[PDB]
């Protein structure tokens, strides 16, 4: 039968690319565990067996840093053995963890390893599943690291002068017989007098070649001599001894297997047969420890005989498969090489190779090992009250360095000699925000008296946070990630001006409480009701970026699902100017002016900045507008510096390298570096060499046609000293938005770069002087952000490009759309209306469905409200203009109108009933099909064909089907209105709609309504006779008809209004009454019916129907029920019983009296919404005639009409009344429109709360 | 469960019980007679969920199920309640359409 061969290679392989592949896999738990544990064990072992100087150079915290330091020549040759074994085992683990294949088994597998590739073979052969292989593989990696240390020691014991001579200890010589090579070695060593320990030896004996190992000096002298010139040679870059039984001994292996006891040697027996690379035979079955010892003996004590392997492997299978069915192909699984040899030696029989990754996808990577999506942003910057103005200022390369105005403080009042007194300034520059006093306290539930005592930074942070929340379409408690208890606030602030100390004009009890320093995030938590973790950070000049790091850490740990990371910097008290302007740290000139031969300092600036961060999975599920993705945050300290102030090049290099190692990206994947650009003459020099060392190390470096640009927002707005990190992140996100690298304003056109950067261009590192196109392509654009502080802390943030998801374009079936606006006052209502109107005029091509989705489902709805419906953006624009002109929302609302559900009788049936809602909302369709199945399980025929098929009207339809169709349609409509959030306050049904009213009131369950209606209809069909009675609609008061009814034996069926009554009786009596009152001028309508309820025709079924109704459960009403039978209200448990339901079908429907009594009792006023549920509005006329024209009746369905005008009028009226709609369920079945449109920001009702 | 007993949001009482020493056919006949005599709607009838060899399990709405057991001709049998409060194992209440709705958000190519 077929078998599989697993092959493992030696150290000669190229493992760095493959190992880099393993470190990037994402949905493999065992592989991640294997990498973590292998690094842990090697980290433990390398302290014991390394000297102090060599350990400090090679010390690593993670496997990615180990792989980095290996390629930099900071490790030793001992690490190569460990890393190659680790790569082989990780490759096996990934191959079998991604395909989901059955683990290799003893009876269908073989394992073979070459020249230290046998350790992984032993580990794999001693396992039954991938769970048992994890600890064994970690132990094997430890043993492989110990094998490398033993060979390094022997290398130094033979050639102590070869600490630098890591030259090839081996070479390949072609066309040389082993015996001739042996004799030549002997003669050369005898003639040249070489010590016995330096003699060459043959490591490997292949068929067309042999490998010669030895000390580089003697080996090269032996090869570089006559009698070997004919042979072609190739050095092998390995620099360790091996395969020499004259140098190693069993006692060397015993030292390797020292820290590896397992209580039973057979704790791990062997399963898969094992083949030796020095014999070509199957090794006798043993346990793990006895097989590792064999592997090390073969590696260090014996010659690797590849010719014997090639001869014996074919014979091994031939002796086995011959006893089996037949010799069949061989799957060959490889890790480094030696496949290509096997199919050639095998083409005599059997061979194949492998590949695969075919298990179902999973849930996205967890809280860790996952990217963080920035979904919105906001802030305030100098001369930029928005992020749009900030970009417009970046684009042209403006600097806004400016002196203090009289608004904050007048320098002329400070005119005085050298400031040796208190509160004496020494510098005059500074970039303040003119718009600092503006606030809207009422939006945040704050008294206008309390507002002046608040810290301005706090108020601007509040408004910016709301703006960022608006820009992401984030509504708390609407998605799993936006539950109020899963939202944290992470603020970074270092200097608080006039927040806790200065105030003297006014003091109250609520002065220090509420604003100490922890009340910025605390007040954000309280005002927005965020009940997750809350922190503040002081890292002075990297407070905001370190706070973003803390927020990312909380998101990676799982402490929150959404993070609000920001920062503020205020200079309201200019006292800080004096302190810094003593060591020349501050500047007596303009803006920061980053790296150049002109730098003299930096200018302080104020600002605010907010970003909302989620995990990428949560933002993808919420349909949020991702701005960018965070890949890694890193922080360290430049503690090993001459002073805290002095920056250290090594520390910054280490931080940037750590970020790069974590992300797994090459330095050539980065197109922009956002530098800290402190502005000091020497400060920027250190950062530039750090950047070049990390990113553009040399000329002709990997930079060939991929330029790197550098710059900093400190050139445009100054040094934020706490908002620098958020400012830089916001700048970088707005570069991806506009696909443009802004010009750099640090260097004047007539100036020159600093002489310490002589050949920036030669390295392919440029500084934009004009806006540069930065197009968005299929390859994401990566940016590195840097932040430093004079406290010594360094933060580095790597930001990627957001992906392109699908945005499923598809036409929306709706013909019109609703656009909703709201505000907490009238001024804001007018402002928001004007802003949306201007926006739509400026962008006439916007999507209307997505506009509706954004305005309704992705917004919070305040007191004042407005709605508009249009078929296109132009119609909506006209209607918005009319709303602006007429007011429409500027006046306070009131009274929250009551909602009455009215259910129509049985004269409203028609084919294709409610088919438009059935085709619009899957929930309605599911409910209707559920009710049809429920009726079928009750013993009644299916009625669903009434509401879908257009064939057949009354010919093939019995009363049961049409009555059940009407009733179940009304119940489904009730469920649909309940989903949208519409809760009735009272119910009323006419004749057959009474049951739906009871269902809506909570009295009956769905089965009890179906049961009662169907049983009543079946009794009617069975007992009564069709066509005996008739109904007569008469335009006369029921009192005036007493004589005509008391003489012709008729009866009053329904009293539908003050002058509308329906009479019932036999056909002869009905005709006689019609003739009699026709001659009197009365207008009558004759209705022919097969069965006449509320007449004498239903007497026989009364007793039977009352007995059946005993089985139904009548519960306590949950809401008022208007009873046309009792002509009063029902609000107790015992009123509705089987006796009530029996009388209802026989006595008169006094709809007029029920409505009149409800009006008198004050239960329904004229300003209440009467939502008419049913196939056709008939109680609307009753309500209009009985109560008046001042009551609004809202139909649902109609025979030949579109639902959307009617459905949207209900939602609009309820929404404008003051009630809350479940807008997410109104938009749910239309995925095309579920995209957030970038609309204007909130129309803040701003006022100047400036304190003198 | 809510479609049959909307007044059983609080009545999460045992929708099932175990009755020992009752033949399935005798239980079926007694259920039929009780339902015919007491005029119970077709959706509230008891049904046998499980048929072991020594016992059977009777499922139904708690109100009708307890009234059926709490009557003569079943006093002899020892009964215990199963604290489960959901319907199941009833082809007269569920249908292939319910299963199709269940397997909605589960396509594999």
UniProtKB/Swiss-Prot annotation, chain A:
Which Enzyme Commission number(s) are on file for it?
2.3.1.221
What segment(s) does the record annotate as region Starter unit:ACP transacylase (SAT) domain? 1-372
Record-annotated Ketosynthase family 3 (KS3) domain positions: 369-801
The UniProt note on the cofactor reads as follows: Binds 1 phosphopantetheine covalently.
UniProt GO BP: aflatoxin biosynthetic process; fatty acid biosynthetic process
Q: Which UniProt keywords apply?
A: Acyltransferase, Multifunctional enzyme, Phosphopantetheine, Phosphoprotein, Transferase
Protein's pathway? Mycotoxin biosynthesis; aflatoxin biosynthesis
Q: Please state what is observed when this gene is inactivated.
A: Impairs the production of norsolorinic acid, as well as of the four major forms of aflatoxin: AFB1, AFB2, AFG1 and AFG2.
Q: What catalytic activity does the UniProt entry give for this protein?
A: hexanoyl-[ACP] + 7 malonyl-CoA + 6 H(+) = noranthrone + holo-[ACP] + 7 CO2 + 7 CoA + 2 H2O
GO MF annotation, one? phosphopantetheine binding
Q: Does the keyword Thylakoid belong to this entry? A: no
Parts of the chain that traverse the membrane: none
Q: Where is this region: Malonyl-CoA:ACP transacylase (MAT) domain?
A: 893-1214
Task: Recount the UniProt induction comment for this entry.
Answer: Actively expressed at 27 degrees Celsius but not at all at a temperature higher than 35 degrees Celsius. Expression is repressed by curcumin.
Q: Which residues form the signal peptide?
A: none
Active-site feature positions: 541, 676, 719, 991
Acyltransferase recorded as keyword: yes
Q: Which cofactor does it need?
A: pantetheine 4'-phosphate
The record's comment about this protein's domains reads: The domain architecture includes starter unit:ACP transacylase (SAT), beta-ketoacyl synthase (KS), malonyl-CoA:ACP transacylase (MAT), product template (PT), acyl-carrier domain (ACP), and thioesterase/Claisen cyclase (TE/CLC) domains. The SAT domain receives a C6-fatty acid starter unit and transfers it onto the ACP for chain elongation. The KS accepts the hexanoyl-ACP unit and subsequent malonate extender units are loaded onto the ACP from the MAT domain for chain extension to generate the linear poly-beta-keto ACP-bound intermediate.
Write out the function statement from the record.
Answer: Norsolorinic acid synthase; part of the gene cluster that mediates the biosynthesis of aflatoxins, a group of polyketide-derived furanocoumarins, and part of the most toxic and carcinogenic compounds among the known mycotoxins. The four major aflatoxins produced by A.parasiticus are aflatoxin B1 (AFB1), aflatoxin B2 (AFB2), aflatoxin G1 (AFG1) and aflatoxin G2 (AFG2).
Please report the name of this protein according to its UniProt entry.
Norsolorinic acid synthase
Native source organism of the sequence: Aspergillus parasiticus (strain ATCC 56775 / NRRL 5862 / SRRC 143 / SU-1)
Please tell me where this chain falls within the complete protein, as first and last residue plus total length: 3 to 1254 of 2109
